């Protein structure tokens, strides 16, 4: 068993498959810790890169709680409220993340259902007699 | 910069013409009005609710809608009224005092006063410290709100059955009343 | 001064001692009939705001930040409700931009959060359903003169 | 009802994750997906390290987001050289 | 005395990243960059010339652009290169002599190397003996440049992985290039 260097949550060397303890090179980031650098494929450059803003000195840092609860573009920089400085860490309520995550999911589900339904309707659009046998179907 | 809010062209006439009547005809709305601020605004929370599919979009709708019911209450006695209207407003407080029941502007006044608030709205955000992103939304329901209004602008802004004076939102008043409205 | 800032015209005045500006009795946020007058001071809303916070920025930001957190029910209308108490009353003035367009002018708890989350989800569901359903009845109406299902499930 | 779980998914998630410091990271990860920074497949893979044991819960989460199962796998050891340096000759 | 230069945080965060790539990640920037110190100042001098009306300031602007180029040529050899980049600089000099054309750094090096010169400008100013009115003249003028650089930070400093794009401003270093440069 070893312990994270940031989290301090013990892990087996088996559970995270891990060959050894890694006590020389750099601090071992446990799984379960948020990403600091994300390579997103656009699926159409092939990719977009996101890097978390570096932590500024304490005084020069500006923490902001936006007036908009739902849908504020954090850009990935966040401090979790319990309930020229453009480097401002947006402060987001936890209840906001529930609304945002659900808002994203429900929109995608509507879009996915639309494309599937449109495509099935589209082959009807390409169609004297339908002969689709939908009346037989029940 | 300055906040850009677009009133529909017919609604612009509604307010501008309405301001003509109060200053010149000195008409005052019968209060409580035929169409209260509440059922106009509470209904908006109802139809648009069945149109938005997202969870957040349902929250933002009730958010902005319930706030407007709150904002109109404090912002009535301050800004939305005219010189002549202010004399009529003063009575209400005594009338509310005589009942001892609290005066609630939203249930009593008509929707045209709500339209007055939206016109003064973009200047009001300018004084506030909200960042742009928050201001966008405040505006985005506002523009989408008035898009509803055009659908029923004929019902209650526009005079339906205009022959009867009760259907007319503002009703003429006595001159000696206007003398008190001057205050001198 | 001679004119009333909220009547926009010369009026008999009740005067706040601290601010030279004075207002006509009619445009009183709480009506204040001349016959019954407050004792001496008659501090205006703008002056009443300064003495209340005691002209302190830290409390002002704090009492603001408290006001937003308090009104979590309506957050988007937080700064607007906070400001409206300080500003002195003012007559409704038709804003220039709406005027400028027209050619002519004449006169010059814990369970509550779950419930608040639940109903929006629940309201979202039928909207999702009825939009999906209306596409389906467009599919049966795509078959001309009769529904393909010929009935409602 | 199916709504009952969803209105409680974060409560069920909060109990299992245990300490807040781990729950915060779970919220930050959920944020990045909603900001379109993090892809859906990458989100489900990270949530696996949180909710892996609760199979009845993780399966529900996989059902909810719509994850469907069944290059960029570079590896940590090797780095690419520029094109110019590859020209040093071999007879 | 001590001269203070307000570098916007975003530009102050780039440099640190540049300090990370060259000393820790051990990758250097492709020297013949696309946006070199010359056209960066060519654009800035050209965008701001039309913006300002008074001919008096146009003289002040043009010399600060003309001056910064001449200073950059002298400065790059001495104190604008990390140790790992010295060899890459040397091969450019060694290529220049064979090509029989003298190396001109403003033509080669990128915008990030211009930012390195700006970072140590207060230290260079304090060392010398200058008129005070010229100290605020440079610093105010530079603070006006950095503001302009902030508005265009997106398309000069882009974060692209060298393994992937190959158009990234930085390119990795072979185990043989690193050996001589550090050894």
XYZ file of C-alpha atoms in Angstrom, chain A residues 26 39 41 45 47-51 54 56 60 84-87, chain E residues 7-10 13 17 21 150 159-162 164-166 168:
32
model
C 8.004 13.276 -8.837
C -6.297 17.226 -24.744
C -10.171 15.986 -29.948
C -5.866 21.293 -35.962
C -7.075 18.805 -31.012
C -7.640 21.582 -28.485
C -5.609 22.006 -25.292
C -6.848 23.199 -21.903
C -4.464 24.022 -19.055
C -1.503 28.706 -12.494
C -1.343 33.423 -8.522
C -3.137 39.332 -6.593
C -4.611 43.204 -15.588
C -6.180 40.362 -13.595
C -8.387 38.201 -15.765
C -7.022 35.319 -13.670
C 3.643 42.865 -16.864
C 0.059 41.620 -17.343
C -0.520 38.328 -15.573
C -1.174 36.362 -18.761
C 2.277 33.269 -16.940
C 5.782 28.244 -18.868
C 9.747 23.954 -21.135
C -2.002 41.124 -24.320
C -0.174 25.994 -26.367
C 0.366 23.100 -28.773
C 1.949 19.813 -27.784
C 5.240 19.342 -29.680
C 1.396 16.355 -31.690
C 1.121 19.479 -33.799
C 4.701 19.892 -34.992
C 4.123 24.166 -31.917
